[PDB]
Amino acid sequence: TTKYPYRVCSMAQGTDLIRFERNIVCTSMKPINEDLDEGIMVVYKRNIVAHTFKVRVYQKVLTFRRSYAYIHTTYLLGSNTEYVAPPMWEIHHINSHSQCYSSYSRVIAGTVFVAYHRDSYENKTMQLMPDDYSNTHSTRYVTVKDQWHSRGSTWLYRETCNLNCMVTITTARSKYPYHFFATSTGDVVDISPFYNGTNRNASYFGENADKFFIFPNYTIVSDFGRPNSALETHRLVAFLERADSVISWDIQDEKNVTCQLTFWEASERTIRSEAEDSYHFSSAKMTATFLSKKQEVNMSDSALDCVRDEAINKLQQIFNTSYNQTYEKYGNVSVFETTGGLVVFWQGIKQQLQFTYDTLRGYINRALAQIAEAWCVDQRRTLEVFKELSKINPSAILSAIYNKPIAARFMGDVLGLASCVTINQTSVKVLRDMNVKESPGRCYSRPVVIFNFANSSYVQYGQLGEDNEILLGNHRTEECQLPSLKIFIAGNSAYEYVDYLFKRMIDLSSISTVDSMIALDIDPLENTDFRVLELYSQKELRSSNVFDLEEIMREFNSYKQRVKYVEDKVVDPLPPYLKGLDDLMSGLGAAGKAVGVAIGAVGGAVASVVEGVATFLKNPFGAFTIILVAIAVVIIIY
Amino acid sequence: TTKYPYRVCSMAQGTDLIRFERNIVCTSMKPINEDLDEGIMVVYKRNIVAHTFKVRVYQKVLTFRRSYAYIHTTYLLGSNTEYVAPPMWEIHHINSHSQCYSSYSRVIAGTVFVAYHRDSYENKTMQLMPDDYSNTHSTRYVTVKDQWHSRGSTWLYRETCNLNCMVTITTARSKYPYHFFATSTGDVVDISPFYNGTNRNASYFGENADKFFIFPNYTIVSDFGRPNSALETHRLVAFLERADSVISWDIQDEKNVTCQLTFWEASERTIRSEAEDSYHFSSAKMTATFLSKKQEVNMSDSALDCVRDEAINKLQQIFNTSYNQTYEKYGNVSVFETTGGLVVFWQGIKQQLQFTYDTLRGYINRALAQIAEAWCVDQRRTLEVFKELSKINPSAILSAIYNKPIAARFMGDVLGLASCVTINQTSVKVLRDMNVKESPGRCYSRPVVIFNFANSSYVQYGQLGEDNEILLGNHRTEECQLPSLKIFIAGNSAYEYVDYLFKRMIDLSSISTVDSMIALDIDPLENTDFRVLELYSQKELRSSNVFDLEEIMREFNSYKQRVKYVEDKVVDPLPPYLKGLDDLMSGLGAAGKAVGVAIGAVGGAVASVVEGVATFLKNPFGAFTIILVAIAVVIIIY
Amino acid sequence: TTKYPYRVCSMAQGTDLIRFERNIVCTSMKPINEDLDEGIMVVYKRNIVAHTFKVRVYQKVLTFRRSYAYIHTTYLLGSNTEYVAPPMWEIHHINSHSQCYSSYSRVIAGTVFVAYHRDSYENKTMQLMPDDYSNTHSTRYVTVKDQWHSRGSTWLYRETCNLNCMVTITTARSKYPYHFFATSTGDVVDISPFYNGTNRNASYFGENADKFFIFPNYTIVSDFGRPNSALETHRLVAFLERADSVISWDIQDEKNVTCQLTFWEASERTIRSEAEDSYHFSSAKMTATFLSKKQEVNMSDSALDCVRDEAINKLQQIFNTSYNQTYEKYGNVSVFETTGGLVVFWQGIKQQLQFTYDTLRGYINRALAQIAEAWCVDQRRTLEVFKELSKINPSAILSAIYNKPIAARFMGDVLGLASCVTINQTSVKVLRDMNVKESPGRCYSRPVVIFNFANSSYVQYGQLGEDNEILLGNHRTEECQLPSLKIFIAGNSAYEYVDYLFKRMIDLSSISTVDSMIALDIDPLENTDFRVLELYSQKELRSSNVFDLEEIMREFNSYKQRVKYVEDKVVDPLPPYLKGLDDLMSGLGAAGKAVGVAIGAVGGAVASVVEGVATFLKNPFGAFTIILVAIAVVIIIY
Ligand SMILES: C[C@H](NC(=S)Nc1ccc(NC(=O)c2cscn2)cc1)c1cc(C(F)(F)F)cc(C(F)(F)F)c1
Ligand SMILES: C[C@H](NC(=S)Nc1ccc(NC(=O)c2cscn2)cc1)c1cc(C(F)(F)F)cc(C(F)(F)F)c1
Ligand SMILES: C[C@H](NC(=S)Nc1ccc(NC(=O)c2cscn2)cc1)c1cc(C(F)(F)F)cc(C(F)(F)F)c1
Ligand SMILES: *[C@@H]1O[C@H](CO)[C@@H](O)[C@H](O)[C@H]1NC(C)=O
Ligand SMILES: *[C@@H]1O[C@H](CO)[C@@H](O)[C@H](O)[C@H]1NC(C)=O
Ligand SMILES: [Ca+2]
Numbered sequence A, B, C: 001t002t003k004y005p006y007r008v009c010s011m012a013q014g015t016d017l018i019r020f021e022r023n024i025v026c027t028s029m030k031p032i033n034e035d036l037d038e039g040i041m042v043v044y045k046r047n048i049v050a051h052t053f054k055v056r057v058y059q060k061v062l063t064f065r066r067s068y069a070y071i072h073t074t075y076l077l078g079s080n081t082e083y084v085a086p087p088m089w090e091i092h093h094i095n096s097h098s099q100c101y102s103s104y105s106r107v108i109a110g111t112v113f114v115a116y117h118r119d120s121y122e123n124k125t126m127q128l129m130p131d132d133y134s135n136t137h138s139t140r141y142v143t144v145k146d147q148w149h150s151r152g153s154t155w156l157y158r159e160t161c162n163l164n165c166m167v168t169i170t171t172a173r174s175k176y177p178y179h180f181f182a183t184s185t186g187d188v189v190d191i192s193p194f195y196n197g198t199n200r201n202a203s204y205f206g207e208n209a210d211k212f213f214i215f216p217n218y219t220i221v222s223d224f225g226r227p228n229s230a231l232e233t234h235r236l237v238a239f240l241e242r243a244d245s246v247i248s249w250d251i252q253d254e255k256n257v258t259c260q261l262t263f264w265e266a267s268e269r270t271i272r273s274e275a276e277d278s279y280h281f282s283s284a285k286m287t288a289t290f291l292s293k294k295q296e297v298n299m300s301d302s303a304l305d306c307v308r309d310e311a312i313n314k315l316q317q318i319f320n321t322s323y324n325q326t327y328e329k330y331g332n333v334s335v336f337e338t339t340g341g342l343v344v345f346w347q348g349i350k351q352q353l354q355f356t357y358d359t360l361r362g363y364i365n366r367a368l369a370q371i372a373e374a375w376c377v378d379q380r381r382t383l384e385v386f387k388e389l390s391k392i393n394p395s396a397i398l399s400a401i402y403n404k405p406i407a408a409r410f411m412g413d414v415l416g417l418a419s420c421v422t423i424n425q426t427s428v429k430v431l432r433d434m435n436v437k438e439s440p441g442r443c444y445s446r447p448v449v450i451f452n453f454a455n456s457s458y459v460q461y462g463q464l465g466e467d468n469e470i471l472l473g474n475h476r477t478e479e480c481q482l483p484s485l486k487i488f489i490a491g492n493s494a495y496e497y498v499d500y501l502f503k504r505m506i507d508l509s510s511i512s513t514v515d516s517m518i519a520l521d522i523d524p525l526e527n528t529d530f531r532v533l534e535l536y537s538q539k540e541l542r543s544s545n546v547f548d549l550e551e552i553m554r555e556f557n558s559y560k561q562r563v564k565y566v567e568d569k570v571v572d573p574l575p576p577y578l579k580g581l582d583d584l585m586s587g588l589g590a591a592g593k594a595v596g597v598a599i600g601a602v603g604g605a606v607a608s609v610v611e612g613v614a615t616f617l618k619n620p621f622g623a624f625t626i627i628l629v630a631i632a633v634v635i636i637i638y
Helices: A088-097 A307-322 A353-389 A394-402 A530-536 A559-571 A579-590 A595-618 A620-637 B088-097 B307-322 B353-389 B394-402 B530-536 B559-571 B579-590 B595-618 B620-637 C088-097 C307-322 C353-389 C394-402 C530-536 C559-571 C579-590 C595-618 C620-637
Strands: A017-019 A039-043 A056-069 A074-084 A099-101 A125-127 A158-161 A164-169 A213-221 A231-239 A246-250 A328-337 A343-350 A407-410 A415-418 A442-444 A448-450 A462-464 A470-472 A477-479 A485-489 A493-498 A504-507 B017-019 B039-043 B056-069 B074-084 B099-101 B125-127 B158-161 B164-169 B213-221 B231-239 B246-250 B328-337 B343-350 B407-410 B415-418 B442-444 B448-450 B462-464 B470-472 B477-479 B485-489 B493-498 B504-507 C017-019 C039-043 C056-069 C074-084 C099-101 C125-127 C158-161 C164-169 C213-221 C231-239 C246-250 C328-337 C343-350 C407-410 C415-418 C442-444 C448-450 C462-464 C470-472 C477-479 C485-489 C493-498 C504-507
Touching (some): A039 A307, A307 A328, A353 B394, A394 A407, A530 C470, A559 B559, A559 C477, A595 A620, A595 B620, A620 B620, B353 C353, B394 B407, B470 C530, B559 C559, B579 B595, B579 C074, B595 C620, C039 C307, C088 C099, C088 C213, C307 C343, C394 C407, C579 C595
Antiparallel strands (some): A017 A415, A039 A343, A056 A074, A056 A158, A056 A164, A099 A125, A213 A231, A448 A462, A462 A470, A493 A504, B039 B343, B056 B158, B056 B246, B099 B125, B231 B246, B328 B343, B407 B415, B448 B462, B485 B493, C017 C415, C056 C158, C056 C164, C231 C246, C448 C462, C485 C493, C493 C504
């Protein structure tokens, strides 16, 4: 199954942005000049090359966790992490020996608080070792992989720190005009990658003054994790100290320039309707409809000399492709610059009753041009439709219209693209179970999977999706209602779960496609389900009533009811008006005209005293005192 | 940015209704008559003009609010509003002096309860002043804009009223045959606007008998709010006392009639396939396919004499547009009434080897007609697709297919249309923040905006949407996970929030459209995110696990789990079976055969006594008594 | 209204499976051979007939319910059902006399527990009577329709059983190659319906060995429910004892075989572009584009002799349909097998300046073929679009593209089809109310309906949907905000609810379709709503703020906020860290350096004692003891 390998792509950061431009206008191609020409043209747009240069990021996560230890259990009373960038000497030590210290020494506005890794009060060094989230364009070298659950002595509230020095090596990508590069994780900095010390006017720079360091001949270790690797001196290295991280990169070298060509497509039949100055290339591809101004762009122009020779030959071959001797060439090659920005160039071609033949050919050409002109609108319609379908599942739409497996994610108003991460591909066991072990009456919705990220030894838990791609998480449970005939696609083979235990594998042949079933299927059987009906017709339709199986329709008819559930449910365990007071309303609810005022005043005084009494009673020491005095009185009775 | 002004259109009442008719059928245009004609026709449908006449509505909102006042805080023990229509003399006073009373005097079935504005027990008068929700088709003149939070004396439960006399001036719209008009706010009445006293048979009337008043020469003030304006006597005014409002309007005058024409479109090439009686106008616009019966509609007909002359000239000009002398006219103009109801009229045109030319022309015409016939189906398909896309975002779909900014809202099964309200356009500050100030760890999803409704001085709070339109509310928060690169479109300029603090404005050029990127993009970068992965692989995937960023797909896989959350969460703080009883089950849960019965009986008696004891204990006076007796006993020990 | 009868189709089990195959490829039809032919062909695909044979299923549901009875109310302390298949002798008794016993006698691993229907300790017999869920393809004969709410003696915890013997008669459907048949309810078994005792190699069998019984001449009662019906001896009957049911069926007889033909369609104009071996039938239907290998399939083949004669005649008639004498036949009929698997057969046809005419005809044919070739892609695009629209409402999409009323439901990755159940059609009262009677401030979203399932006398409750089809449940409530103008479609007639009380019926003519309104509507009115605005601009936008009326858009902007509501709401009434302990954190929260440790230790000891004291206090007997000793001490004071 090399066609569809396991992939966990549901996450996509920046470095790629695409949009769905709203307004595109089609023309009205019947102003003048019922007579018209035809030739052979080839089309290509303008593109720019990006740059990838493998930045590095240093960071140090420190978290406090305070807890209390009972005799048999240990309660955690909350925890809080925070990220702080390391000082410069620590970064020098990291880049020189691939080991970092275990004592952070920040100062907060009046004095220093020397934190420690394990409250051991030592200045030791810790190595770096690989982490369990690898890629082809990412790596980590965290130094404390585990978490510390030290129970400690009973009845002793104590707090601990977990300094977790880390280095990561991502790959960034910047585009023209090269004045901000976004890394793989998501960090964005407004500095040109080509900015060395003395290129302020030529290359952009807008970050800060004393947050920038350029080092020449910086001895950097080749690969972290190995205790003693081999060093290698780079030319220039740049550091960009931020408030919570440190970014570093190699000062890149000057860019190569060849030209901007794409080779969009090469057509074979075009139609030209010259109105007055707006030569229309009504191409017969039914997807190309351009416009240009009636001026040759001077083929000997100083912006396209790479394709200058390559411009001619292809046209010639396409001529010899189909126009051997019946069709004769007409003039030299011509070059037109369109309104969009793409250069398109073409070669003209041509071939009593001769007048009749010419009239027939002209009429047919006019008909075809008008048909294409009317066809122009469905492209606008399709873009409009996709602009709304992309709100349901961007990944599917983009992968369908690009013919590549692509993971995309919304970023407010513009999509962000990325490829798919690839799992080990060897150890992925699909459990033959769907029932939640702990909870009776609830079973998973999609089979649970246990994959393993590359170059690691730590298992995970995800759930199978469509086309054999893993989606993260283990929380797609659902109440479930026997019998069931779930079938999951892993093309070209489908799993068949019957009553939630893995009946058998089935080859994908006994499920007729709707496309091949446009004709009359014999007859639907009109089946029924009795558990759901018996549950509805006893009025406890709360949880198992429906699972919204036809989701996006049946789901929005119920949401306004869940909102009321949540509101009413929240109001009761939400701080009331001093629940003891809640009776007074009922006291006035029944009857009473003016006794209510005096009753309210007396109740106010009484409640003022009793609330203090109860507040004293709630502390354990006060409760013990009450118990002691009660026992003492009872003993005194004797 | 005059192209896209700020607008707050997310609300749309009636007065406009549109539908998505399901079944439209395409024909089979090859019965007979392979030979066929062609001409030039122009098409227009039938429309009717509406009527807008600026009704007025009087109302009086009165609300009770009861509260208790502690020493440092004031609790509100609920409140309730209610709307009541004012009596007739109050309306006369309002329309004569633009000031209304402050004492409502309803009777409830046995006696009168004279309410008062502030329990001041006076019969004063209050002026009317403008409200903070204006429009081009709405206004209000509320008399008490604020709310009364009078603390009052401590320890005194008291209730207050807030009589809030109001008048509003909307604009209604009614359509043929003029027998019900719906106002802007949403009120609908079944009375023809032309119904004066003596038009029962000619104009509809179906509301009631003693709920209608017609006044001649009613002295009405010109504009409320000004203490002394200039009066103006209208001809007839009508009042329609309802149970909770009073509607009034001017008795309109008799309608003008000219004709019903639309000028749908003017084509240039048509194709006619006369089968036996069903002349088919297979127009070359690829969107027009009509049918009619083989009978001229008698151009000298008494329903279209306005366009009678205008019918001919346009055809002539289009002839001179393209048919100078090669194409000769054929007969007189002809008029056909289609099956839909639209009248279409046309002028016929025409021009050894002549037979060959005729055969070629006929074959080409047949081919084009068949192509259009096959094209007829995609319109049905597109309507079917839009019928389901309209369930995702009606406003976007309707604005796309109408090329106007339109706000629409479902009304059960039929859409309701309206334009967009326009804000002051001058003072709209977009805050450069996204973090919720009070709650740490939660930050907004779209930037928060502070606009200002026209002709007011009271700020509001809304959130920015797409294409620079404000959507109401301040509640789109979300847990959020650094780093972020949010980009919001305000065409043609996009805001860029990096880590939720307003990095900088960016011109909309560095985001390549997918339409212009049909070709091969270089390569996606395969990025990753470590915070989400570390959160998943420790099994606390509850709140920050996912935000359903690719919403409508990832959202319905989780809904059945939120349902279980809500159910289990509700069950516990929901009235149990007298929680003291809950132990008995466990008492029988472990073991026991027949001791359970006796234990249950004894527990029943004990619980019967103890519940009464606890009910006595819960009142503050009983608690104070218990405290007093305990202290007295302890003192007595001494 | 026979066009749209009431139907309750929202449920669909298996027995029908369809799929949405992803990749379909269009060709490039310009390799070679600019010259090309044309003929007349007819097309039909391959289909297989299914089998329906009316299985039977026996089952016995037994449920335990334990409860306690107070003096005025009766609490139920949970209940649990379970399904168990009956033994063989009980099934023999059921099939011989249509009455079943009331005493289940299972054994659990060490001894028998004889359950009883009502703890009456008797071995009586109970009849079978019809149930209130009937169909054309389902029935039930449950023996205990009601539920037992016997109050019993006060203060006596007791449990009861409700044995509910049942038999059902569904209809299954199996398809080629007949090796698993799925019943209507949802049960699936992997046995060929034709498997009698001695067909192991010819017919599949994969269930088990000692879970199968074949009985010859089994005297089976004709119809259950009647105390004494007429018997009828079938040939062979098969039982398939499962763990919780018993399935039975008649051993079917050998299948008939005629042929596999469908008669897809009969075209009239085709275009053939023979490249080298891949004759392309570029049909002019604009939906047919095939491919085959250059070899006749030997019309005298032993797989299609049924249509062998019928193959010729239709072609002939279509010739006489349009080709009388101008068009002459060319050779004999030819038969081509396509790549898909469908056989298509065709008859060729044909008809100085002759060369010119031939060139014109060839050029036109090439143009039309290229247009169809370019058209091939929109079918792929439409399938891609429907693959995502089917995630919103499968029923609507399938019913639109099949032109039949079809209820479909997702089954993981493949759709399941069924027709619509039909209600009595006579007694369906649509209540003229929408306000929830018990709850003030909440009113239904769609009108509530009271239908009645066929052949029953037990009312139900459902809600009206679109196109006059009932959807089950009574839980689509919503907070609601006057005024309202709801209009519900029951084509061709719409209900109009104004302020939620059934204003009047309206014929469907005063709502203009968007399809007929492509032109300029006069002007939208720009209406407004004041209740919603006043609710927003006072900051209590929690429940009535919005109902997500434009659902699928406004709904996913709020979901991440409901998630936080649920999380925060759950955390508080979720088992805390022994709430008495919660103070210690605040004790260390303010200040303290080392007194916290000693305070924590003392608090630990005190809490250890006090928790035991409170646990003793929570039992009713301990509370009564405390009350007794307190009263005794107070009396002793005297
Ligand atoms: C009928 C009477 N009801 C009272 S006195 N209701 C009440 C409740 C609350 C407040 N005030 C505040 O809650 C408050 C908060 S801040 C300021 N005031 C004031 C009055 C009653 C009194 C007794 C007694 F005499 F034994 F106490 C027992 C019962 C019994 F047996 F039915 F339970 C009933
Ligand atoms: C094991 C025994 N358990 C009992 S007696 N359980 C029980 C609970 C509830 C009910 N009945 C109702 O709740 C009821 C509601 S309406 C009608 N009846 C009846 C019985 C037990 C008794 C004592 C004692 F003697 F001190 F009380 C202390 C403990 C201790 F130390 F473990 F806590 C345990
Ligand atoms: C300020 C002082 N606060 C204390 S002592 N706080 C505290 C709370 C909890 C724990 N420990 C555990 O909860 C625990 C669970 S497991 C192990 N330990 C330990 C200490 C205080 C003491 C009194 C007194 F003396 F009357 F009691 C009254 C008040 C008053 F008037 F303000 F209410 C305040
Ligand atoms: C280079 O940068 C300097 C900044 O000091 C600027 O003044 C100058 O115009 C730029 N260009 C050249 C050619 O020096
Ligand atoms: C029939 O089934 C038997 C199973 O014992 C198998 O050995 C045999 O090959 C099958 N076919 C024939 C023709 O006997
Ligand atoms: Ca199309």
